[PDB]
Amino acid sequence: SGQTLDLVNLGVAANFAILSKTGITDVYKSAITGDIGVSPAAATYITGFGLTQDSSTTYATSPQVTGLIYAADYSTPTPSRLTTAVGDMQIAYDNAAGRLNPDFLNLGAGTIGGKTLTPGLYKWTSTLNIPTDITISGSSTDVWIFQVAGNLNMSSAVRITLAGGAQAKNIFWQTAGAVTLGSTSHFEGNILSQTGINMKTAASINGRMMAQTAVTLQMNTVTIPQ
């Protein structure tokens, strides 16, 4: 009973703070909590992590990651598990993009600085810009799905706050274009990008970065929920 809008099922992708298809580019010293993976690209497309594969052929380690690094060219079970994960990313993406009967349509005509986002399903038939702080407000069990037919841009220093008990694990952002999060910004939620997700210097996120191209980082704090 209660809110009718169902969660997006991430499948095995839920086990990653970052998952992409073509690569992960890191510069400076990031602090990632949770696992990171890339498929079908190989581990050579994970750059900047000081990656060491000294003990397992199934994973690698980095001083920047409280977690493990997985790539398509590692040994069993990693390739098959990454293919599954990526396939579940795709499914989740389509699942988020395909919800109907939105509660909010073209809120702010595509620029939502200063708004309080109450629960439910949001659609923009355009790029979405977040140039000033926003609040996501609702219960600890409520769901938000944000459908973006364009890029998702959040400005430097912008903070997404959570009111009422809203949780990051229950928030999903689906973007047909790239996501770009500005220096020192703070984001909340799962991001399902059809292309890239790019964070700039000292930005932070509580959530997941699931990109169907590449993710780029610059001294970011990325923390998987729970």
CSV table of C-alpha atoms in Angstrom, one decimal:
chain,number,residue,atom,x,y,z
A,1,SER,CA,0.0,0.0,0.0
A,2,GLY,CA,1.1,3.6,-0.1
A,3,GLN,CA,3.0,5.3,-2.9
A,4,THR,CA,2.3,3.5,-6.1
A,5,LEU,CA,5.4,4.5,-8.0
A,6,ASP,CA,7.7,1.5,-8.0
A,7,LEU,CA,11.5,1.6,-7.5
A,8,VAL,CA,13.8,1.1,-10.5
A,9,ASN,CA,15.4,-2.3,-10.1
A,10,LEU,CA,19.2,-2.0,-10.8
A,11,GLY,CA,19.9,-5.8,-10.6
A,12,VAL,CA,23.6,-6.5,-10.2
A,13,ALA,CA,24.4,-2.9,-11.1
A,14,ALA,CA,23.3,-2.0,-7.5
A,15,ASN,CA,26.7,-3.5,-6.4
A,16,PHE,CA,28.7,-0.6,-8.0
A,17,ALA,CA,29.3,2.9,-7.0
A,18,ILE,CA,30.4,3.5,-10.6
A,19,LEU,CA,29.7,1.3,-13.7
A,20,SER,CA,30.4,2.2,-17.3
A,21,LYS,CA,30.9,0.8,-20.7
A,22,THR,CA,33.8,2.6,-22.2
A,23,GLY,CA,35.9,3.8,-19.3
A,24,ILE,CA,36.5,5.7,-16.2
A,25,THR,CA,38.9,8.7,-16.2
A,26,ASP,CA,40.1,10.0,-12.7
A,27,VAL,CA,42.4,12.9,-12.0
A,28,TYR,CA,43.7,14.1,-8.6
A,29,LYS,CA,42.7,12.0,-5.5
A,30,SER,CA,39.1,10.8,-5.4
A,31,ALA,CA,37.5,8.8,-2.5
A,32,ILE,CA,35.2,6.2,-3.9
A,33,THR,CA,33.1,3.9,-1.5
A,34,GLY,CA,31.9,0.9,-3.3
A,35,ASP,CA,32.9,-1.2,-6.2
A,36,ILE,CA,33.7,0.2,-9.8
A,37,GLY,CA,33.4,-1.6,-13.0
A,38,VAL,CA,33.9,-1.3,-16.8
A,39,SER,CA,32.6,-3.5,-19.6
A,40,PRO,CA,32.9,-4.2,-22.5
A,41,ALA,CA,36.1,-2.1,-22.3
A,42,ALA,CA,39.2,-3.5,-20.6
A,43,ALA,CA,41.0,-2.3,-17.5
A,44,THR,CA,43.3,-0.2,-19.6
A,45,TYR,CA,40.3,2.2,-19.9
A,46,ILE,CA,40.3,2.9,-16.1
A,47,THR,CA,42.9,5.6,-15.8
A,48,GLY,CA,44.2,7.6,-12.9
A,49,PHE,CA,43.4,5.3,-10.0
A,50,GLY,CA,46.9,3.9,-9.4
A,51,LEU,CA,45.4,0.5,-10.2
A,52,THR,CA,47.2,-2.5,-8.9
A,53,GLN,CA,46.5,-6.1,-9.8
A,54,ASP,CA,48.9,-7.9,-7.5
A,55,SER,CA,47.0,-10.7,-5.9
A,56,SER,CA,43.7,-11.6,-7.7
A,57,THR,CA,43.1,-12.0,-11.4
A,58,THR,CA,39.4,-11.2,-10.7
A,59,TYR,CA,39.8,-7.6,-9.5
A,60,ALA,CA,42.1,-4.8,-8.9
A,61,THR,CA,42.7,-2.4,-6.0
A,62,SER,CA,43.3,1.4,-5.7
A,63,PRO,CA,44.2,3.7,-2.7
A,64,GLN,CA,41.3,5.9,-3.9
A,65,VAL,CA,38.7,3.1,-3.7
A,66,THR,CA,37.2,1.5,-0.5
A,67,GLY,CA,36.0,-1.2,-2.7
A,68,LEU,CA,37.3,-3.2,-5.7
A,69,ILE,CA,37.8,-2.5,-9.4
A,70,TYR,CA,36.4,-4.9,-12.0
A,71,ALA,CA,37.1,-4.9,-15.8
A,72,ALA,CA,35.9,-7.0,-18.8
A,73,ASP,CA,39.3,-8.7,-19.3
A,74,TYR,CA,39.7,-10.1,-15.8
A,75,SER,CA,39.2,-13.8,-14.9
A,76,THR,CA,35.9,-15.7,-14.0
A,77,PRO,CA,33.4,-14.7,-12.6
A,78,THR,CA,34.2,-11.0,-13.5
A,79,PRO,CA,33.5,-10.9,-17.3
A,80,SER,CA,30.2,-12.6,-17.0
A,81,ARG,CA,29.1,-10.7,-13.9
A,82,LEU,CA,30.1,-7.3,-15.6
A,83,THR,CA,28.1,-8.3,-18.7
A,84,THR,CA,25.1,-9.0,-16.5
A,85,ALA,CA,25.6,-5.7,-14.6
A,86,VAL,CA,25.8,-3.7,-17.8
A,87,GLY,CA,22.7,-5.5,-19.1
A,88,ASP,CA,20.9,-4.6,-15.9
A,89,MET,CA,22.0,-1.0,-16.3
A,90,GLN,CA,20.4,-1.0,-19.7
A,91,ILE,CA,17.3,-2.5,-18.5
A,92,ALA,CA,17.0,0.0,-15.6
A,93,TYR,CA,17.6,2.8,-17.9
A,94,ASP,CA,14.8,1.7,-20.2
A,95,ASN,CA,12.7,1.0,-17.1
A,96,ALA,CA,13.1,4.5,-15.7
A,97,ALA,CA,12.8,6.2,-19.2
A,98,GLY,CA,9.6,4.2,-19.8
A,99,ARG,CA,7.5,5.1,-16.9
A,100,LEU,CA,4.2,6.9,-17.8
A,101,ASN,CA,1.8,9.3,-16.2
A,102,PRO,CA,4.2,11.8,-14.7
A,103,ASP,CA,3.3,13.8,-11.7
A,104,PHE,CA,5.3,16.8,-13.1
A,105,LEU,CA,5.9,17.7,-16.7
A,106,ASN,CA,8.5,20.3,-17.8
A,107,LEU,CA,8.7,21.8,-14.3
A,108,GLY,CA,10.5,25.1,-14.5
A,109,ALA,CA,10.7,24.7,-18.3
A,110,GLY,CA,13.9,22.8,-17.6
A,111,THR,CA,15.6,25.0,-15.0
A,112,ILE,CA,14.8,24.1,-11.4
A,113,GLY,CA,17.1,26.1,-9.1
A,114,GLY,CA,15.5,26.7,-5.8
A,115,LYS,CA,12.7,24.2,-6.1
A,116,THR,CA,11.5,21.6,-3.6
A,117,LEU,CA,10.9,18.3,-5.4
A,118,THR,CA,8.1,16.3,-3.8
A,119,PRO,CA,7.8,12.5,-4.5
A,120,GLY,CA,6.9,10.9,-7.7
A,121,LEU,CA,7.7,10.8,-11.4
A,122,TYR,CA,9.1,13.8,-13.3
A,123,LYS,CA,9.5,14.3,-17.0
A,124,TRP,CA,11.4,17.0,-18.9
A,125,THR,CA,11.3,17.0,-22.7
A,126,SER,CA,14.5,18.9,-22.7
A,127,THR,CA,17.8,19.3,-21.0
A,128,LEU,CA,17.6,19.9,-17.2
A,129,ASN,CA,19.6,22.5,-15.5
A,130,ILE,CA,20.2,22.9,-11.8
A,131,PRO,CA,21.8,26.3,-11.3
A,132,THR,CA,21.0,26.8,-7.6
A,133,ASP,CA,20.3,24.6,-4.6
A,134,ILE,CA,17.3,22.2,-4.6
A,135,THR,CA,15.6,20.0,-2.0
A,136,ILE,CA,14.2,16.6,-2.5
A,137,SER,CA,11.4,16.1,0.0
A,138,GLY,CA,9.5,13.1,1.2
A,139,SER,CA,9.5,10.0,3.3
A,140,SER,CA,12.1,7.3,3.9
A,141,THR,CA,10.3,4.9,1.6
A,142,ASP,CA,9.2,7.3,-1.1
A,143,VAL,CA,10.5,7.1,-4.7
A,144,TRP,CA,11.5,9.8,-7.1
A,145,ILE,CA,12.2,9.1,-10.9
A,146,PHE,CA,13.5,12.1,-12.9
A,147,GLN,CA,13.2,11.5,-16.7
A,148,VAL,CA,15.5,13.9,-18.7
A,149,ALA,CA,15.3,14.1,-22.5
A,150,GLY,CA,18.6,16.0,-22.8
A,151,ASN,CA,21.6,16.8,-20.7
A,152,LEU,CA,21.5,17.1,-16.9
A,153,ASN,CA,23.7,20.1,-15.7
A,154,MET,CA,24.3,21.1,-12.2
A,155,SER,CA,26.2,24.2,-11.4
A,156,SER,CA,29.4,24.6,-9.3
A,157,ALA,CA,28.7,24.7,-5.6
A,158,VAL,CA,25.1,23.6,-6.0
A,159,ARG,CA,23.8,21.3,-3.3
A,160,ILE,CA,20.8,18.7,-3.5
A,161,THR,CA,19.4,18.4,0.0
A,162,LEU,CA,17.2,15.7,1.4
A,163,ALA,CA,14.2,16.6,3.6
A,164,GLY,CA,11.6,14.5,5.4
A,165,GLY,CA,13.7,11.3,5.3
A,166,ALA,CA,14.1,11.0,1.6
A,167,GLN,CA,16.9,8.5,0.7
A,168,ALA,CA,19.4,8.5,-2.2
A,169,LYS,CA,18.8,4.8,-2.8
A,170,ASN,CA,15.2,5.7,-3.7
A,171,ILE,CA,16.1,8.4,-6.2
A,172,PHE,CA,16.7,7.8,-9.9
A,173,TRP,CA,17.9,10.2,-12.6
A,174,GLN,CA,17.6,9.0,-16.2
A,175,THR,CA,19.3,11.1,-18.8
A,176,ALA,CA,19.3,10.7,-22.6
A,177,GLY,CA,22.4,13.0,-22.8
A,178,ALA,CA,25.4,13.6,-20.6
A,179,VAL,CA,25.4,14.5,-16.9
A,180,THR,CA,27.8,17.3,-15.8
A,181,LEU,CA,28.2,18.1,-12.1
A,182,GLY,CA,30.1,21.2,-11.3
A,183,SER,CA,33.1,21.8,-9.0
A,184,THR,CA,32.1,21.4,-5.3
A,185,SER,CA,28.6,20.5,-6.1
A,186,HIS,CA,26.8,17.8,-4.0
A,187,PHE,CA,24.4,15.3,-5.7
A,188,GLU,CA,22.0,12.7,-4.3
A,189,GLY,CA,20.7,9.7,-6.1
A,190,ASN,CA,21.2,7.0,-8.7
A,191,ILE,CA,22.3,8.4,-12.2
A,192,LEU,CA,21.4,6.2,-15.2
A,193,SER,CA,23.1,8.1,-18.1
A,194,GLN,CA,22.8,7.0,-21.7
A,195,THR,CA,26.1,8.7,-22.3
A,196,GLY,CA,28.6,10.1,-19.9
A,197,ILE,CA,28.7,11.3,-16.3
A,198,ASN,CA,31.3,13.9,-15.5
A,199,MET,CA,32.1,15.4,-12.1
A,200,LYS,CA,34.4,18.3,-11.7
A,201,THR,CA,36.9,19.2,-8.9
A,202,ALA,CA,35.8,18.3,-5.4
A,203,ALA,CA,32.2,17.6,-6.3
A,204,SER,CA,30.5,14.8,-4.2
A,205,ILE,CA,27.7,12.3,-4.6
A,206,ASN,CA,25.8,9.9,-2.4
A,207,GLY,CA,24.5,7.6,-5.1
A,208,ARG,CA,25.7,5.6,-8.2
A,209,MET,CA,27.2,6.7,-11.5
A,210,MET,CA,25.9,4.2,-14.2
A,211,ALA,CA,27.0,5.4,-17.6
A,212,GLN,CA,26.5,3.8,-20.9
A,213,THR,CA,29.6,5.6,-22.1
A,214,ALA,CA,32.3,6.9,-19.7
A,215,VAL,CA,32.5,8.5,-16.3
A,216,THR,CA,35.1,11.2,-15.6
A,217,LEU,CA,36.1,12.3,-12.1
A,218,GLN,CA,38.2,15.1,-10.6
A,219,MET,CA,38.9,14.6,-6.9
A,220,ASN,CA,35.5,13.5,-6.1
A,221,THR,CA,33.8,11.8,-3.2
A,222,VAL,CA,31.6,9.1,-4.5
A,223,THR,CA,29.7,7.1,-1.9
A,224,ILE,CA,27.4,4.2,-2.7
A,225,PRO,CA,24.2,4.2,-0.7
A,226,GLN,CA,23.6,2.2,2.5
